[PDB]
């Protein structure tokens, strides 16, 4: 619900009592499907500003990875904004998570801005972090689990 003369647009909370976007929200996935058009226009501009951590609560999703290079700078916002623009009241695209490619040496890294990160430990197929490398240095070493 929008508010007059410069007042925050209240986001109708669960109990059915419009609350304000600058806070911590829990988005029952289904909701996020018949609502993105809104999400992206009021809560999204908010999350980027770094003032409204939101938990999209979806049971078990498919998950696309995207390894970028920690050397160079990157801002994970568009590989997310796009994912949002592909959510119909019908179906959502496999949640995409950006992940730095694990380096061998101790490289200087560019401050990247990330947003998507799962709560449950869904890193169960990593297998190995730097097969050939004599030792991973910046990436997350993941010695072949015995």
């Amino acid at each position: 619900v929008p508010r007059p003369n410069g007042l925050e647009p209240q986001l109708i909370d669960d109990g059915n009592v419009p609350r304000d976007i600058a806070g911590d929200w829990v988005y029952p996935s289904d909701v996020l499907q018949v609502s993105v058009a809104v999400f992206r226009d009021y809560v999204w501009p908010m999350v980027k500003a770094g003032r409204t951590r939101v938990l999209v609560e979806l049971g078990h999703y498919v998950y696309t990875l995207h390894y970028y290079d920690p050397q160079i700078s990157l801002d994970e916002a568009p590989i997310l904004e796009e994912w949002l623009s592909k959510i119909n009241p019908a179906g959502i695209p496999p949640v995409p998570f950006c992940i730095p490619i694990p380096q061998v040496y101790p490289c200087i890294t560019a401050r990247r801005v990330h947003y998507a990160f799962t709560s449950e430990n869904n890193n169960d197929s990593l297998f190995s972090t730097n097969a050939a490398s004599i030792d991973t240095a910046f990436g997350e070493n993941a010695a072949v689990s015995p």
């Binding site: 619900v1 007059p4 003369n5 007042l7 209240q10 009592v17 304000d20």
Partner: peptide
């Protein structure tokens, strides 16, 4: 009565 200039619904206008 400024925050009430534009009515959206019955729910009373109050934030945090």
């Amino acid at each position: 009565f400024s925050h009430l200039a534009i009515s959206t619904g019955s729910l009373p206008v109050w934030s945090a």
